[PDB]
Amino acid sequence: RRLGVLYRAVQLLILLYFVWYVFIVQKSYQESETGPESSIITKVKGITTSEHKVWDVEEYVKPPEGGSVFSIITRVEATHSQTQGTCPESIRVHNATCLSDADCVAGELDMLGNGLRTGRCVPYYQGPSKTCEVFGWCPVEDGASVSQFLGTMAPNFTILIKNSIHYPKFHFSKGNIADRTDGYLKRCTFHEASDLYCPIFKLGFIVEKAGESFTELAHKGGVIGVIINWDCDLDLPASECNPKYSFRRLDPKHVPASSGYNFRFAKYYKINGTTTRTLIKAYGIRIDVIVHGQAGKFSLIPTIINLATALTSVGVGSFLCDWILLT
Amino acid sequence: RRLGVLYRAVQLLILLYFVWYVFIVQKSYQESETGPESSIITKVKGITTSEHKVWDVEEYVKPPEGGSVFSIITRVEATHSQTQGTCPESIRVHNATCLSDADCVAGELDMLGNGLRTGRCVPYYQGPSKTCEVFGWCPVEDGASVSQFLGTMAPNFTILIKNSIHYPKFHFSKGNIADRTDGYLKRCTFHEASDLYCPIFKLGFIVEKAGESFTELAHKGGVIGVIINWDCDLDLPASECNPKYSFRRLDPKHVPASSGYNFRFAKYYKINGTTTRTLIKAYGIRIDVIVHGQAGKFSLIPTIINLATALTSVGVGSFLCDWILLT
Amino acid sequence: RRLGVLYRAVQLLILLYFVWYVFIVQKSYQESETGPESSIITKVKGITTSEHKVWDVEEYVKPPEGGSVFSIITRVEATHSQTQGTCPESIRVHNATCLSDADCVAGELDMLGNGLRTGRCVPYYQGPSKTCEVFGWCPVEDGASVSQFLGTMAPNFTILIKNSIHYPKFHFSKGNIADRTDGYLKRCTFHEASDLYCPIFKLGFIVEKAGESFTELAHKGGVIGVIINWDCDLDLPASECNPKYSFRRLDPKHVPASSGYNFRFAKYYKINGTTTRTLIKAYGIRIDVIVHGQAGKFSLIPTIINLATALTSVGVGSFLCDWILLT
Ligand SMILES: *[C@@H]1O[C@H](CO)[C@@H](O)[C@H](O)[C@H]1NC(C)=O
Ligand SMILES: *[C@@H]1O[C@H](CO)[C@@H](O)[C@H](O)[C@H]1NC(C)=O
Ligand SMILES: *[C@@H]1O[C@H](CO)[C@@H](O)[C@H](O)[C@H]1NC(C)=O
Ligand SMILES: *[C@@H]1O[C@H](CO)[C@@H](O)[C@H](O)[C@H]1NC(C)=O
Ligand SMILES: *[C@@H]1O[C@H](CO)[C@@H](O)[C@H](O)[C@H]1NC(C)=O
Ligand SMILES: *[C@@H]1O[C@H](CO)[C@@H](O)[C@H](O)[C@H]1NC(C)=O
């Protein structure tokens, strides 16, 4: 009687749970593939100015080739006319300060120093201190570097990411630009809803979507990641598989020591037969384009496994009801 | 009687379906791992010529280091003796054409322009038009660039990809060159059957296997991906795990706007104390080596799950036959 | 009687096997995700010396930007004052040796040669042999290169890897540096137990943990991979997810032909209006930072599938016991 009503209510509850959670919500009827094959072609385009200098893309984008990882230099500390010679050590180098020649040890190369110590105390670049003389690339950066801010109009720089994926097991291939001939990429601006196949992003848009302040991320540097997630359901048509662009800062923005991004490169010249160089310490924003994939397609093996599990679970509910009735 | 024959025929049909499709075909008795750890070492080697110039690998391969992504330059547009100064704007820049000084706005920096506008109309490099004067790197590329075709013998360039994978969960590690001392790599040519452990590919072979035409992909540029798939069955010996090299074009070859690959780099010089440069716009073929993995090894958990599913399915066939007989 | 004891012993054996192997050992109650999103920021810092030259990071680290793949140059073969002209071919080029002008074919460009053959026999750089004259970058490397060993103090170079992962499906994100303000990274040394969030590694430590000898890996070059495995169990707190750094050599160290790492880059100058260059062949150790992920979190679907399998298996044991008793 009523025992039958409760007995069948348990079965319906178990079947509901399976049909909803296991199948509709979690798609246990589906087999999944992750890690597609991606191709990223980037192209930064924009020009900026300094006190009397004009910087083009060749100057502030390293490396020049358009790939997943590139750095947009927003500030430089250039040390011009560096030659191999003898000069005072940087005041920031461990026990570089000296009062006499006895305080400097000859032939001492510090790995964090700027050269091999000559062994005699020399006046610093700006008085009145005295630092141990070193042989290396001179003058040192910490004594003869001039800072230039490039990124006054870095926010208006535009980056064009060209992505294309492929899912081998499911034979799915797609890109992030629509095959058109209407002059679209020459006048479009990215919008996650209106214009999703115009992957031309301003640097300022990327930074603000990452939650970052451009001045702080430009003076000290930073790393911002442009993440493309192709969470794809292959039972739906190919027009239902779209790229989702997320922006987030990838460097340890909270650790004071490791926050920032910078690197050194030099420009090499022969002046009167002697090799001179211009050491440039570049602070800038590195853009990493990370592509992530998660596909899904209906597979019969998972479906039958879960159906068998549902039947066994309904049987276990049967056993539980009978056991409660007996006791 | 005959009901028994049909009843057991249903069981045999269900068991066949499982034993064939679930186990033999799909290998549901197996656990899978994807995404191994890969190491790619590339080395392009070949020399080409121009009207009176000889180009070596250092000149047309960027970046010089041998990694997954590199570009082989097939054509350049070099603008020599570029200095920071004032010169006419490119005729391709928005509203650069002027008839008088009033048509040029002083201090206007266009992000797609080639400098900061001085504010006075100047004659173009070739008459009779007049363009707004700009301050930047001068002369501009669109007025003083000379094109040189490098890739006359690019098809005979040879790329040596050195790959090595590792599957952590299954403790499988392999490479794409056989440990030999017979002078093999100095005289071998790749063949997907005869010579699969001689990964020395001519650029023309890669292009033709990608279905591309070398002249069009060399003048305008392109991106070709060398895909290595280690679809591996670990129940078989290690000699049964082999690399499969596939070649396909990765750029949007159909979109007119985004088809092609190019980038700019410059050579910097000091001439009479003033920084001059040679801006080179390089059109070439980028080679991406993409390594994809899918391993499989027999695991007891999937086997028992599928066996339980088979037994439950045979029981469901039993129930269906009995239900048909009753009704 | 005793049949009951054996009958229930079989059930307990099957249940033990499941509860131990399927659940406790293999964690079949868990769903897994692999392939997180990684960000790698490297920074090599150290200075070395030669006979009379001091080398800084800008000189021996290529590329300058701090990413996953970079090369630390330990030895160079620099060919200075290379200009486009005519010079003897390298004695190592196929049939380059000549006895008279008839042995040289005019206009012959060998892809493995160093230029276009002029067609007349010229004396070699060192006597008494004679090689076919070529037009290219002259003098050739095999005749005018000078070797300098940089890596006397390469083992004391320190590399700072900055990693940060993210698991999308499980919403887990972590890095490899602890958020601190105690001046930790300026004085810490990595230890896999004591100091795991100080990812500052000496090059010598990386090499010795890889099992390599620094002198051989420095003269000839090599590739060493720094592997970070985030094998993560998400049922445990976030303090229980840690990076595991493994070091191994990635190049074919056993194949004599393919063992080693080297590349060429040049320094370009204008001398009296003619383009000269310094071709540098760099032998060094390439560091690849490979990040691998394997997360796990309790999921109800696998748990119920395995519980149903356990019940079915106990039933199959029931059937086997009854069948043995009947026969
Ligand atoms: C630095 O030099 C001073 C004076 O020569 C010496 O007392 C001190 O120990 C040195 N510090 C080192 C070597 O770390
Ligand atoms: C450049 O970007 C800034 C902020 O990102 C914006 O205020 C400014 O209007 C932009 N420039 C132009 C010409 O729109
Ligand atoms: C270009 O300049 C012309 C004349 O100064 C002006 O009419 C036009 O609006 C300008 N186009 C712009 C600013 O996009
Ligand atoms: C170079 O390649 C082209 C086509 O790829 C071929 O026709 C030619 O014979 C090759 N050169 C040599 C010397 O074999
Ligand atoms: C090299 O040159 C010699 C003499 O000209 C010739 O006999 C030989 O066949 C050549 N080898 C080649 C072209 O591989
Ligand atoms: C540099 O490293 C070597 C071995 O890696 C070691 O013997 C030497 O002591 C180190 N240098 C210093 C100053 O500790």
Author numbering:
A (entry chain B), B (entry chain C), C (entry chain A): 39 to 365
Question: Which sentences from the paper describe this structure?
Answer:
The P2X2 receptor (P2X2R) is an adenosine triphosphate (ATP)-gated ion channel with few small-molecule modulators that exhibit poor pharmacological properties. It is known to be involved in the auditory system and has been proposed as a drug target for age- and noise-related hearing loss. Each P2X2 protomer is composed of intracellular N and C termini and two transmembrane (TM) helices (outer TM1 and pore-lining TM2) connected by a voluminous extracellular domain. Three P2X2 protomers intertwine to form the trimeric receptor, with each subunit adopting a dolphin-like shape, as first established for the zebrafish P2X4R (zfP2X4R).
To investigate the subtype-specific features of P2X2Rs, we used cryo-EM to determine the structure of full-length wild-type hP2X2R in an unliganded conformation. With a constricted pore and an absence of ATP in the orthosteric binding site, this structure represents an apo closed state —a key conformation for defining unliganded pockets and understanding the molecular changes resulting from subsequent agonist binding. We refined this cryo-EM reconstruction to 2.7 Å, allowing detailed structural visualization of this P2XR subtype. In the apo state conformation, the three TM2 helices are arranged in a “teepee” conformation to form the closed pore. In the apo closed state, the three symmetry-related side chains of I343 form the primary constriction gate (0.6 Å radius). In addition, another constriction formed by the symmetry-related side chains of T350 comprises a second, more cytoplasmic gate (1.1 Å radius). The primary constriction gate in the apo closed state is only 3.7 Å deep into the plasma membrane, as measured from the start of TM2 (Cα of L338 to Cα of I343), and thus the TMD forms a teepee shape. In addition, the surface-accessible volume of the orthosteric binding pocket in the hP2X2R is ~2,700 ± 400 Å3 as calculated by the program Fpocket, similar to that of the hP2X4R (~2,700 ± 19 Å3) and the rP2X7R (~2,700 ± 35 Å3), but strikingly smaller than the binding pocket volumes of the hP2X1R (~3,300 ± 200 Å3) and the hP2X3R (~5,100 ± 20 Å3). In agreement with these predictions, we observed V60 at the extracellular end of TM1 interacting with I339 of the neighboring protomer, D273 on a β-turn in the lower body at an interface with the TMD, and G353 on TM2, directly next to one of the pore-lining residues V354. The simulations using our apo closed state structure reveal that the left flipper is a conformationally flexible region, with an average fluctuation of 2.78 ± 0.81 Å calculated as RMS fluctuation (RMSF) across the three chains and all replicates.
